[PDB]
C-alpha cells in the first residue's frame, strides 16, 4: 500500500514561490534607484 511525498513536494513549490516573490520585490526596489 505506496509512497506519498506529494504533500511535502507541494509544500516545497510553495516555499519556492515565496522565494520568487522575494526576488520580485528586491528587483522592484532596485528599479526605484
Amino acid at each position: 500500500d505506496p509512497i506519498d511525498i506529494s504533500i511535502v513536494l507541494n509544500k516545497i513549490k510553495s516555499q519556492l514561490e515565496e522565494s520568487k516573490e522575494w526576488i520580485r520585490r528586491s528587483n522592484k526596489i532596485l528599479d526605484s534607484i
Binding site: 511535502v8 528586491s26 526596489i29
Partner: protein
C-alpha cells in the same frame, strides 16, 4: 535614500535565500522518505 533602498533590496534577497534554505530542508525530508520506504517496505517484501 539610495543607501536605504539598497539595504532593503538586500534584505529582500536574503529572505528569498531563506525560503530557498527551507525548500532544501524539505527536499532532504522527501528524499529521506523515499529511502526509508525502499528500506522498510520494498527490501523486506523482496526478502520474504
Amino acid at each position: 535614500s539610495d543607501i536605504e533602498k539598497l539595504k532593503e533590496a538586500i534584505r529582500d534577497t536574503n529572505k528569498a535565500v531563506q525560503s530557498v534554505q527551507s525548500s532544501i530542508g524539505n527536499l532532504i525530508v522527501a528524499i529521506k522518505s523515499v529511502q526509508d520506504y525502499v528500506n522498510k517496505e520494498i527490501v523486506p517484501s523482496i526478502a520474504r
